[PDB]
Amino acid sequence: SDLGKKLLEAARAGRDDEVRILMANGADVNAADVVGWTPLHLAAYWGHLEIVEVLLKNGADVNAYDTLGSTPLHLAAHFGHLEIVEVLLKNGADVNAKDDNGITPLHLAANRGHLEIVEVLLKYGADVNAQDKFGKTAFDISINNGNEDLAEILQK
C-alpha cells in the first residue's frame, strides 16, 4: 500500500508525529519491505522506543520474522536497546525465538556483551542452553569473547 511504505520510512527515521498520523489514517503495521522487515523491526533496529510502543498498541506482530527468521527482539537485543527489549517482552515477544541459523536474542545480546539485556531476557525465561546451528550457547560466546562478567551470569 501507499501508507504502508510511508510507515516503513517513518518508523526507520523515528518521526514520532508522522507515525501518530499514519496510525490514525490506518497505515498497515504488518507492511514489510523486500527483506521482510515490518515497522516494528525498523523501530527495534534504530532504537525508536516511542514508535515500538505505538506500533504494539496498534496490533503490530511482536513475533513477526524477516526472510531469515529474525524477530524485532533479536534486533533490540543485538543493538543494545534495553527499554525496547523490555517493552517487546511485556507485549509477549518470544524470548526463545530462533532465526534460520538457530540464533536467539540471548546469543546476540551475549555476543555484543549487553549485560542488562541478558539479565532481562533471563527474567522472561530465556533458554540459557539454547544452541545455534554450530552447537554454541550464550556461555560458549562469553568464553570465546572473554567477557568474564557475562560468563558469571550465564553459569546457572
Binding site: D2, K5, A13, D33, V34, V35, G36, W37, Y45, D66, T67, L68, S70, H74, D99, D100, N101, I103, D132, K133, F134
Partner: protein, 457 residues
C-alpha cells in the same frame, strides 16, 4: 526509484519516460537516451537518466515548444508515477557553477564518531534547517541513505573442523556472486579481460548461497550452509569523505529575497549546536564565494579611487570630478527597470552591461564638463553660459551614439531563438540603461557641474 529497487523496475519507469516523450512531445523530441543504472547522486540499480534530444530550433516554434515549457509539462506529467521520483530539468549554461543562492556544505566526523553518529548529526542539522524555511529552502543531503545488506558470518571453527580453507570459501563466494577478473586474452588482435562469475539464476536470493560447494582437504564437497550464518543489517551504499575525514555533503539554497551569505551564516549557527566531534566546512561554489566576496570591497574601492584621481588630473581640480561621477545611477536605474519589468536576473551579462552603460554615460559627462570648464578657463565665460554652450555642442554626438547603439542592441532584446538567454541578458539591461543614461544625463550633468562648482567656490 526507492532504495533496494532492481535494474528491471528502473527499466520499466525509463520505458514510460521514453514513451511519454515519443508520444506527448513527438513534435519536439528527436530522441531519448535512456541510461539505466546511472545517476549523479550515486550509481546503483535503483537510479537512471533519460537524456532528451530535441528537434531543430526552426521545427520547434514559440514558447510552448522550448526547453522551459517541455520541462514543466514533463515534471508535472511524471508526478503521478508511483514508487519513483521522476523530474525533467534544463542543463546549466556552464556545468561547473551550479546556482547562485545555492551552497555546498560538508558535515565532518572530526573525532572518529562513526557513520551512524554522523548520520544522526546530519538528521539533527537537516531537522533544524527545515525549522527556518524563511532563510533556507531545499536543505537536502547530496549522498545516499543506508540500505538492507546481507551479513554472512563464516564460522572459522566449523571451517577448520571440516578442513575447508577460508581462501577457498572467500574466493568461491567472491568469484561466484561478485565476479573475478582472472587475466587477459587476445580477441581479433585486441587484448581483453576474462571474468568468471555465477550464471544469474544462482546468485539472486539467500537460498542460492547453499547451492555453492567448497572442496575440503579430504576431497568432500561442503555447501556454504554448513559453515556460514546470515542476517539482514543496514549499511551505507556510498561513504563520502572530505579532506581525509568521513563526511556528508549537504546541498541547499537561500530562501527567496535572502543572500547566500545569510543562509551560510545560519547553517554555521545551526552546525555549532551539533554533537561533540561534528565539524563542518564549505566546498565548491561556497568555498569560491567565501573567498571572492572578501575580494569585492577592495576592487570596488580601488576602482572608484583611481577614477576620481584620473578625473582630478584631467580637470586639475579635486571638486569637479564629482560632477562626472554623479552620473552613475542615471544609467543603472534604466537597466534595473528594463531587467525587472522583463523578469530577467542580476546575471554577469547584466552586471558587465552596467559597467559599459556607466562608462558611456561617464564618457558623455566628461566631454560636457571639459567643454564647459575650458570655455570658463580659456574664453573667460560664466558658469551657466559655459555649461549651456557645452551641453548645446554635445547634444548631437550624444543622441547619435545612443540612437545608433540602442538600435544596435534592439534585436538582442526581442531575440527568442537559439542563445536568446544570453542575448536578452546582454541587450535588455543595456537598452534600458542607455534610454535613461541618454535622457537623464543631458538634463542632469549640467545640474551636477553647476551645483559642484557653486559648492566648492
Amino acid at each position: 526509484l526507492p532504495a533496494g529497487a532492481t535494474q528491471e523496475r528502473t527499466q520499466k519507469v525509463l520505458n514510460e519516460v521514453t514513451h511519454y516523450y515519443l508520444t506527448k512531445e513527438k513534435n519536439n523530441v528527436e530522441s531519448v537516451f535512456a541510461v539505466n543504472g546511472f545517476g549523479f547522486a550515486g550509481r546503483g540499480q535503483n537510479t537512471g537518466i533519460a537524456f532528451v534530444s530535441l528537434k531543430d530550433w526552426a521545427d520547434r516554434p514559440g514558447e510552448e515548444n522550448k526547453v522551459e515549457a517541455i520541462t514543466m509539462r514533463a515534471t508535472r506529467a511524471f508526478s503521478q508515477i508511483k514508487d519513483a521520483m521522476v523530474f525533467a530539468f534544463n542543463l546549466p549554461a556552464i556545468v561547473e557553477l551550479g546556482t547562485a543562492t545555492g551552497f555546498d556544505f560538508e558535515l565532518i566526523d572530526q573525532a572518529g564518531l562513526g557513520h551512524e553518529k554522523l548520520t544522526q548529526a546530519r538528521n539533527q542539522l537537516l531537522a533544524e534547517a527545515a525549522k527556518h524555511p524563511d532563510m533556507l529552502t531545499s536543505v537536502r543531503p547530496n549522498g545516499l541513505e543506508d540500505t538492507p545488506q546481507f551479513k554472512i558470518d563464516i564460522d572459522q571453527e566449523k571451517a577448520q573442523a571440516l578442513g575447508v580453507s577460508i581462501n577457498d570459501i572467500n574466493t568461491t563466494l567472491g568469484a561466484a556472486w561478485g565476479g573475478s577478473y582472472v587475466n587477459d586474452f587476445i580477441d581479433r588482435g585486441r587484448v581483453k579481460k576474462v571474468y568468471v562469475m555465477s550464471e544469474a539464476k544462482y546468485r539472486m536470493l539467500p537460498d542460492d548461497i547453499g547451492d555453492w560447494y567448497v572442496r575440503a582437504a579430504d576431497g568432500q564437497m561442503v555447501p556454504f550452509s554448513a559453515f556460514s550464518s546470515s542476517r539482514w543489517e543496514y549499511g551505507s551504499p556510498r561513504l563520502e569523505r572530505y579532506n581525509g575525514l568521513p563526511s556528508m555533503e549537504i546541498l541547499g539554497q537561500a530562501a527567496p529575497g535572502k543572500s547566500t551569505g545569510e543562509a551560510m551564516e545560519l547553517m554555521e549557527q545551526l552546525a555549532s549546536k551539533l554533537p561533540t566531534g561534528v565539524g563542518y566546512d564549505w566546498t565548491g561554489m561556497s568555498y569560491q564565494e567565501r573567498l571572492s566576496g572578501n575580494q569585492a570591497p577592495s576592487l570596488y574601492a580601488i576602482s572608484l579611487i583611481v577614477v576620481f584621481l584620473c578625473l582630478a588630473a584631467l580637470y586639475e581640480s579635486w571638486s569637479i570630478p564629482f560632477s562626472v561621477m554623479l552620473v552613475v545611477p542615471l544609467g543603472v536605474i534604466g537597466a534595473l527597470l528594463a531587467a525587472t519589468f522583463r523578469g530577467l536576473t542580476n546575471d554577469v551579462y547584466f552586471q558587465v552591461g552596467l559597467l559599459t552603460t556607466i562608462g558611456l554615460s561617464a564618457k558623455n559627462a566628461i566631454l560636457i564638463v571639459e567643454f564647459a570648464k575650458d570655455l570658463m578657463d580659456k574664453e573667460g565665460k560664466g558658469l551657466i553660459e559655459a555649461t549651456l554652450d557645452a551641453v548645446r555642442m554635445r547634444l548631437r554626438p550624444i543622441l547619435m551614439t545612443s540612437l545608433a547603439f540602442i538600435l544596435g542592441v534592439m534585436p538582442l532584446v526581442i531575440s527568442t531563438g537559439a542563445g536568446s538567454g544570453a542575448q536578452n541578458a546582454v541587450g535588455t539591461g543595456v537598452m534600458g540603461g542607455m534610454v535613461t543614461a541618454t535622457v537623464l544625463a543631458i538634463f542632469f550633468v549640467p545640474v551636477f557641474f553647476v551645483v559642484v562648482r557653486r559648492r566648492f567656490s
